[PDB]
Amino acid sequence: MNYKKPKLLYCSNGGHFLRILPDGTVDGTRDRSDQHIQLQLSAESVGEVYIKSTETGQYLAMDTDGLLYGSQTPNEECLFLERLEENHYNTYISKKHAEKNWFVGLKKNGSCKRGPRTHYGQKAILFLPLPVSSDLEHHHHHH
């Protein structure tokens, strides 16, 4: 399914990658150079994905402020629900804050869009995970 292949969180809305700082900050940026934007997405449960930084070691979670931050420990908050939305884009909603209808989006200024500030029809929720980091020599498991 996934073997050492990180991706970036695109926000067609503005067009930037979601990065996580070791200071517990989350902001967008369209600079591949940025050595952090590289996040590793994983699936734990059905329709559930995990976003954590492979640079510092923090997990992408949405507090009550709706803002994104790095959690010291693995909490359901770090776990989000991913689905296939129209326009050919994927979305993400916080578990602990799923009923809150919060989406991981960014503004055009490359700023995180408050959780309790997202809705359907916006180009902020629509996210496209782009492939990052390439590693030659790719083999598979044989029966």
Measured distance CA(125)–CA(46) in Å, rounded:
20
Distances (CA, A) of 54 to 22, 23, 59, 73, 86: 11, 15, 9, 14, 30
Q: How crowded is residue 133: how many other Cβ atoms within 10 Å of its Cβ? A: 13
Q: 75: annotated binding-site residue?
A: no
Report the residue numbers after which the chain has a gap, meaning the C atom sits over 2.5 angstroms from the next written residue's N, or none: none
Binding-site residues for heparin sit at 13
Binding-site residues sit at 13
